[PDB]
Amino acid sequence: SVFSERTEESSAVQYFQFYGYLSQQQNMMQDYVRTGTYQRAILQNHTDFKDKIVLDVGCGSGILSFFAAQAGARKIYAVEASTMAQHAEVLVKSNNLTDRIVVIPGKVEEVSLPEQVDIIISEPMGYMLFNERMLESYLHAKKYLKPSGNMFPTIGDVHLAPFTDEQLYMEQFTKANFWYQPSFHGVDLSALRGAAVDEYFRQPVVDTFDIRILMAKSVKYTVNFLEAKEGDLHRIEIPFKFHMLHSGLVHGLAFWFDVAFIGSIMTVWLSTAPTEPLTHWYQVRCLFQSPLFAKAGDTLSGTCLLIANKRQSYDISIVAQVDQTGSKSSNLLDLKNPFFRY
Amino acid sequence: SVFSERTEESSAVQYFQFYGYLSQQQNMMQDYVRTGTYQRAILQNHTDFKDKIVLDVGCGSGILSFFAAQAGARKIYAVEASTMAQHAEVLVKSNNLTDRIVVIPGKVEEVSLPEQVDIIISEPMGYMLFNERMLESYLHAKKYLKPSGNMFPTIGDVHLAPFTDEQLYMEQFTKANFWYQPSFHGVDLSALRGAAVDEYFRQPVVDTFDIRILMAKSVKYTVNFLEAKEGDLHRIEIPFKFHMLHSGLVHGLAFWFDVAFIGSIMTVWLSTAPTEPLTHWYQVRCLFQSPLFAKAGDTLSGTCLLIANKRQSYDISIVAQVDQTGSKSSNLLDLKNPFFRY
Numbered sequence A, B: 001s002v003f004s005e006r007t008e009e010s011s012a013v014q015y016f017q018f019y020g021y022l023s024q025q026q027n028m029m030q031d032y033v034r035t036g037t038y039q040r041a042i043l044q045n046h047t048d049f050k051d052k053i054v055l056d057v058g059c060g061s062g063i064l065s066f067f068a069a070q071a072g073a074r075k076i077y078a079v080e081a082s083t084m085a086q087h088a089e090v091l092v093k094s095n096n097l098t099d100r101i102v103v104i105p106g107k108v109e110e111v112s113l114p115e116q117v118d119i120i121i122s123e124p125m126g127y128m129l130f131n132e133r134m135l136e137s138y139l140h141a142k143k144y145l146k147p148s149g150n151m152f153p154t155i156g157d158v159h160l161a162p163f164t165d166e167q168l169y170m171e172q173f174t175k176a177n178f179w180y181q182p183s184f185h186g187v188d189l190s191a192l193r194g195a196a197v198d199e200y201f202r203q204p205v206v207d208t209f210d211i212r213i214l215m216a217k218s219v220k221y222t223v224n225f226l227e228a229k230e231g232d233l234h235r236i237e238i239p240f241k242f243h244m245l246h247s248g249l250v251h252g253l254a255f256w257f258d259v260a261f262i263g264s265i266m267t268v269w270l271s272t273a274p275t276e277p278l279t280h281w282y283q284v285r286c287l288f289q290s291p292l293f294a295k296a297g298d299t300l301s302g303t304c305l306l307i308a309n310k311r312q313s314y315d316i317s318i319v320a321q322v323d324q325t326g327s328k329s330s331n332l333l334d335l336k337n338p339f340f341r342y
């Protein structure tokens, strides 16, 4: 299928084992901002669901299908590839909704649905929006979407901004400097110090932070899910030009994302911005191995390039320069191995 | 090979990616008890190494091979299956030991050595000793051992003992009772509560604890690595008869382990007991779904059965009874998915 061709079986097994756990479902359901905002988006746009046919891509426990049902959907096909499908089935029976929610086990790329659908709902966002490459499954699912069908969420905005955080930088550097030792119990480790630094700075940092560390207005890159095709996400090129508002060392870029549910009645935003209440997505920071000095009024320009890999993640390349000085930094991050710092 | 026949490729990929990170090597090197005790065992038994041929099974960064070298080994074959082999090679060159340490990339079950060896060294111990099933690779490697060759470590003792820990026990129901809600954003989740309890009780708990929670002297199960065969570890049957020293509820069994390096000059012990300084192995606790009441002087008897699975771990079955009352408890745990509670 399209899923097995873009995915190592090793990555798929680990991925679906992980989403098989009820503890993991619970962790996500307890994020009140996530769950409450999805509910608000669907219920305040009840006319986008009333008497409609719905597809839920990756329904997990089924929670979004239940929200579609509360909003009056006639029929909801809830597709789920993990063993969580069986738990979803139990809840559909115990909430007396077997007439309206139909769980269909398997990958959305491999199953057959009996009907085209009016609206697709999902939670395909990973860290930094794109991690897990579940957005591809969500877009693939448009093959079941009626002409002029909607998607919830409808659009995703990635935000990037340069930051300064000396303590974060030093934490990671200090960990790599373990490999400087010329005599660790009598053994010289120092030839691996370079590789150790590479490895630590390759890890994106998932945590929150105070917005004061941001040194310029964010740049926005928008994916419109109504119009994008799965192959658009194999290679994502994000040019950026920051107008520096504060002088200081730039230790890297911070990422967060918003999605909008663009309904008939109203548009509801789910934000993971550091100005907004915290979600289980936190925010994400990619450190530069060598920080760049910049003055207020300078321009920091470059490119964030995401290349999809077969481990359901992305190789991240960030090249940035201070235009006024020609000072450049180049970085490769492996979004599959983030450092969870909270 | 013997390795690929007992192992899902999905488990092997995850396993070797994990040991490929220098951060993970560093975590193990920084465990002072681990590293210092291996060094003491090898250096204080210099006659087991001086001018000898050595095999290092799963050398990682190469640290144990360097210790063999400091003790006078003529030749050390250092076998490693992860991408860590390349980093080990760099360290052998930077420490000017290419004449003495030969790194051989690949599984010890698949590679070729040019000669038989006088002694095998390794750190095959996982959680509860047996997790990761690397003891099998260690024993398999005896095919390269000269008649009357040694092994470091020489023997491994698993210890089990009943414990009481009311707070730990209760934490499981507290977590699962998230599902005992008739209207979570309008959805009745209560049908999944039993399955959530099942899932948490299947997880062994990896953390440390105060020795006062132990309710009887440990029982010991010993593997002699000079004499054991690979197949002896596929099914491990540990009968137990505890003579209760304290009255209370028994919430489960605690596990820890010791290994001994039995050299020509001295025997050195590496212990992970809760009476001893803490290591990165901690200790492990398996809860019973139903606790058993026992009085001081009663006998709690039964069996701990470890059955090897293809995810490089074990299914753990524990059946226990208080002989004086006939009250019984039976429990199945998945050692692959431990709960890290520290």
Ligand SMILES: N=C(N)NCCCN(CCCN)C[C@H]1O[C@@H](n2cnc3c(N)ncnc32)[C@H](O)[C@@H]1O
Pocket (backbone or CB within 6 Å): A003, A016, A019, A020, A028, A057, A058, A059, A060, A061, A063, A064, A079, A080, A081, A082, A084, A106, A107, A108, A109, A122, A123, A124, A125, A126, A127, A134, A137, A280, A281
């Ligand atoms: N990063 C955080 N925190 N959350 C990201 C959202 C996690 N999301 C939970 C959604 C519950 N509302 C993943 C679920 O979608 C399922 N799934 C994935 N890919 C497929 C596929 N190709 N076909 C069918 N199902 C798939 C997965 O098994 C899991 O149940």
Ligand SMILES: N=C(N)NCCCN(CCCN)C[C@H]1O[C@@H](n2cnc3c(N)ncnc32)[C@H](O)[C@@H]1O
Pocket (backbone or CB within 6 Å): B003, B016, B019, B020, B028, B057, B058, B059, B060, B061, B064, B079, B080, B081, B082, B084, B106, B107, B108, B109, B122, B123, B124, B125, B126, B127, B134, B137, B280, B281
């Ligand atoms: N902290 C816990 N819990 N355990 C410690 C793990 C000990 N150890 C670190 C070594 C430093 N002395 C594991 C290494 O052995 C390697 N490895 C495993 N199995 C094989 C095999 N069948 N053939 C070849 N190499 C193998 C693995 O790649 C890894 O580097």
